[PDB]
Design a protein around this ligand. Sequence first.
Ligand SMILES: CCCCCCCCCCCCCCCCCC(=O)OC[C@H](COP(=O)([O-])OCC(O)COP(=O)([O-])OC[C@@H](COC(=O)CCCCCCCCCCCCCCCCC)OC(=O)CCCCCCCCCCCCCCCCC)OC(=O)CCCCCCCCCCCCCCCCC
Ligand SMILES: CCCCCCCCCCCCO[C@@H]1O[C@H](CO)[C@@H](O[C@H]2O[C@H](CO)[C@@H](O)[C@H](O)[C@H]2O)[C@H](O)[C@H]1O
Ligand SMILES: CCCCCCCCCCCCO[C@@H]1O[C@H](CO)[C@@H](O[C@H]2O[C@H](CO)[C@@H](O)[C@H](O)[C@H]2O)[C@H](O)[C@H]1O
Lengths: 133, 112, 52, 37, 140, 207, 108, 226, 90
Amino acid sequence: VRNQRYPASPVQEIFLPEPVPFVQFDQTAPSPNSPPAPLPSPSLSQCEEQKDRYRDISSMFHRGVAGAEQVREAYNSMAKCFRRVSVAEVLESDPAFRQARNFTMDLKQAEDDQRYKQLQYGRVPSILTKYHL
Amino acid sequence: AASTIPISQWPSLLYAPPSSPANPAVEALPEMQFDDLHYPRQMLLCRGAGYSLEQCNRMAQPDARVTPENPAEKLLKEEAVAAIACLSQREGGKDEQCRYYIERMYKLANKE
Amino acid sequence: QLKAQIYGGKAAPENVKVACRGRVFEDADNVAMAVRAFCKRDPRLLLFQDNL
Amino acid sequence: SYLNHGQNGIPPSVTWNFNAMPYGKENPDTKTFPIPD
Amino acid sequence: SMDHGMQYSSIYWETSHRTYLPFWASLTQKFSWKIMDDQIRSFLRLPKPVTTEPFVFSSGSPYIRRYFGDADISVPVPLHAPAHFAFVPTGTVSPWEETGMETGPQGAAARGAAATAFRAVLESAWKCDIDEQIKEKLHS
Amino acid sequence: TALPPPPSANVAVSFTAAPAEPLSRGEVKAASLKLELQNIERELKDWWMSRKILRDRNIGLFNLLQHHNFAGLSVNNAKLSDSQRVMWTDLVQGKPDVEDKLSVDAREMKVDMYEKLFKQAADLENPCRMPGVAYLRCLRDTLTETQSARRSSCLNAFSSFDACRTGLLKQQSAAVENSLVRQNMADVRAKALFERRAVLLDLVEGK
Amino acid sequence: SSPHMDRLLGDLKLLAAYDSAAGWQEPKAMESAFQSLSWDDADVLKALPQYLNCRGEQKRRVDFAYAALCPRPVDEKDPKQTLMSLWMKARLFSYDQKHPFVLSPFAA
Amino acid sequence: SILGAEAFPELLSKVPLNPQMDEDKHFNKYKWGNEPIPVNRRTGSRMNSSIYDNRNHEAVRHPWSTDARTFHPNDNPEADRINTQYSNMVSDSFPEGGFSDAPRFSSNWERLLAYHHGLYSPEKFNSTTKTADEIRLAVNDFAAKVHADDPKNACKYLMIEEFKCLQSAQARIDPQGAATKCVKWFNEWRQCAWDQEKMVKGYNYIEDRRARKHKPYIGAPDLQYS
Amino acid sequence: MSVFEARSSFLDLEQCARAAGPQRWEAECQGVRQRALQAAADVMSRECGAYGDSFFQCYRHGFRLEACQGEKATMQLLRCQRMVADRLVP
Ligand SMILES: CCCCCCCCCCCCCCCCCC(=O)OC[C@H](COP(=O)([O-])OCC(O)COP(=O)([O-])OC[C@@H](COC(=O)CCCCCCCCCCCCCCCCC)OC(=O)CCCCCCCCCCCCCCCCC)OC(=O)CCCCCCCCCCCCCCCCC
Ligand SMILES: CCCCCCCCCCCCO[C@@H]1O[C@H](CO)[C@@H](O[C@H]2O[C@H](CO)[C@@H](O)[C@H](O)[C@H]2O)[C@H](O)[C@H]1O
Ligand SMILES: CCCCCCCCCCCCO[C@@H]1O[C@H](CO)[C@@H](O[C@H]2O[C@H](CO)[C@@H](O)[C@H](O)[C@H]2O)[C@H](O)[C@H]1O
């Protein structure tokens, strides 16, 4: 059942092994130099099908011919539609996120910065501090 | 390529694990601690001093000798907040919608 | 003296120590006698950092 | 009274045997540090 | 059924393997200079080994040598009846009992601080949910 | 001692002895009483066997400790030397300290004796080991001093040591008390079960 | 009717899945997890900047709980791991500031 | 009112927690598929191991009734073992969920007697394997305690290493097998103890003169050793 | 800490709420609220700890064990909590 990484294992592994993948981003496409455009602020005017389908499927489940997976799916879609407006309200109201919204920076400054010198993990205190010695 | 690790090489496997897409801080693995004796020892010491159970429970505090905190949470604060906002707005960064912030953070942290 | 000779009389790292066959030496110890005691006829020394 | 009709010491908690000692030219259960040639 | 066993494997000599024994080997015999050396030492009053003295100075605790029919065959035996000490309280442990199943501090500590913390987190989340339910019920 | 196994029929009885008429009220009640009796006997057996096994094991442990000449927080050993007893009582109840009458070499020897004794007594899992070792290390550091000048420096560690010490003592006391209470409750329950079984045997019926 | 509990358990499952996919070399699965890691919770989003500035006993409680759940130190260079850690810590901070934690076995 | 709506994102978004779940629920997000862990490695009972034992490869006998189907270690593993983490390695020598030889005692005195005779310990019978994180936490706590005990000790790291090897070999559930691995570090610690003692208390011996044939060949270098 | 105590605490809460009113309850009935929640929490912990510890073990082991297969590891805990709530608060 396993899909071998090296179908020609005795030969492929030697001169063309597989490297450790990189998951932060694709790394094969260009790097955007601009942030994403601010999506339109949402509202409850877009929960039509979500609400009505959730109602229908909940009724059909109370009957007993619907199931639970459909109920979960519909409820989660509707809840996402509501969380959209909740998060929009939070972002636009709370002040700590205004800087994050109007945050901008370039790869050149990223490479020129020098904060990477201080990314060293600390050291756990001594166990004698528990006894206060 | 990835060959079996016998049972005799497990102690070295624990503090020098193989490379993965999500690696831990190998230089900090010897610093990960979580004391199961914290509260028992605290209570024992206080009761030996002469306090009561209620006084001991009021004076008790959580352990500070735990795994250290990531310095990124203090150095890359603004970039992390911006990335989290992007994720909250763009459904977790599906189809590469927070690549901007993620790549800025990656560059800042790695420097080639 | 061995540590200074290794690091060229310059500032060495912190908590650096010497071991032979897994056995740590004191800094105020003669290398010859310490080897005679711990690693007899196996003088392979290792410099490591002792934070612990 | 029948509680004291039969206490020398106790049975051993653990035991060690000869077959538990490792042996082998290649067996890494005997290798700590390389022995010089 | 172990004594007086049969020959289980074959005995043989491979072709042209050497033997290293001459034809007078059976008349040859061994010899050690140790007996003569001991006689000579005793006669000339040469330095004796300390094994001739039963008391042992090679440690702090008292040891006495037990000899097996000769000064060359001895074993040191300790004289002290050593007193042992335990900085431990009695009746504070019942290992046969599984303690992770009983409710109490000893139970949580036979379990761990991680499980206790997880239980406390679940407790807090459940309290949040129940507080929401209480609000929506009493507001009616 | 045991009884011999009960006798068995020589000719095979398969079902010839089975009842040809349903039971009656009295027989049903007698069966219920028999079940109650067997449950009571099971409980009594559990109590008795647990008590017996624990008593035997603990007496064996005591004899083993007495045979190997052990001494604990409760100093109840008569084969101890007076010096060893003084040292152990200082580690358990008093304050370990070197006297000014001694020479520096003898002070070093005394501290080494304290350290050896305490390290053989307390293992790495023991809570008081670190405070004790810290206090003795402070003593080693402050050998070439007087007790008056050494107190100010070693008090901060002796406090923690004494705290752990008193904690262990309180643990031992509480363990004794709780074990006594639990034991007495169990024994009373067993006695009550025995009397209940007695009355049920006086009421039982059959032959 | 139990959103806090549900999302807590879900986030834990997703952390476990991310770790397993990393061990098995599965970028697709681990990115699926990261995307499904409940980033649209207004409460946690609002508590994030509060945790980033908290200090003292509350911070120590939250860090104790986070070490109980995820004691392994993440790589200081992996922003995805850093962000998931921050999100879990913010969730715990919200739960704590609503109803504080009681981490000691001794309590009454 | 449905139960657990927001609690199964793994199900809503087809996120598998492991290749087994992926293969089961047919999510197909693991590029390399799944090689199932067979049942003889998922569960089983403790077995005798030594060839110098007559009941080798046979289940261990206990006072209680036990399923005698044994856990089989992975003796012929595949060349590619993509996950070389402790999680996937431990399954080749122990079952993660523990062995299937745990008792359910009908009474308390049976438990007491088994323990008294050395045939039962809950630490050994009612337990799972230790995860790498737990092992590391225990090792680091022990190392801190040892360092606090004595920093200027030479056998410190040797003691730490025997502790580490016991924890890694799961001595809680396989004490004999783990001691078989850690007795070497114990022996090294013993040697280091003697060495430290002889360096502290000056203990030396009169060395004899150099032998006439110390060098096998005149042209050979006589490397000096302390 | 017991079911009886928790039920009595919730009755005290409800009667004090009826006394205060729908406008000042949240301000006048905080201590009783906290006591009731803590008692219900102790009950929930006592009656659902096994399932919580099982979920914790499954999470530690990445849901690789036998008992961690499927969704029972989570549904059991959620069902225990729902039962405790339905037994206490109404
Ligand atoms: C093609 C190549 C050409 C190029 C050459 C290249 C090579 C160049 C380099 C040289 C080679 C080096 C190679 C490396 C060698 C390492 C290996 C090795 O050597 O040992 C292996 C090999 C391994 O054996 P082993 O099992 O390991 O045991 C090792 C022991 O240490 C030893 O074992 P052992 O001690 O048991 O064996 C000794 C043996 C033999 O030892 C001896 O005998 C001592 C030697 C004495 C020789 C002189 C006496 C001759 C008498 C002749 C008279 C006969 C009557 C005349 C008849 C004439 C008509 C035919 O003893 C006996 O068997 C019993 C005899 C006991 C009596 C001896 C003393 C009395 C002597 C007088 C007789 C008196 C009889 C009275 C009876 C009683 C009456 C009352 O060693 C031997 O076999 C030793 C004996 C070898 C004999 C070989 C037989 C052939 C000899 C002829 C050689 C060629 C001759 C050439 C022409 C010259 C002659 C005309
Ligand atoms: C002008 C100086 C004298 C010039 C002539 C030198 C001749 C020396 C070579 C003779 C052979 C020496 O071979 C070997 O070396 C030295 C002595 O030298 C001895 O070595 C031994 O005794 C000497 C005492 O002198 C010790 O210092 C040494 O630690 C010990 O190993 C050996 O017992 C001897 O077997
Ligand atoms: C009936 C007539 C009897 C005649 C008796 C004649 C007695 C002659 C006795 C000479 C014995 C000499 O014995 C030999 O001498 C040399 C030096 O001299 C010693 O010394 C030699 O070996 C030792 C170490 O191996 C070192 O001292 C040194 O490396 C070397 O000089 C040997 O250790 C000793 O084995």
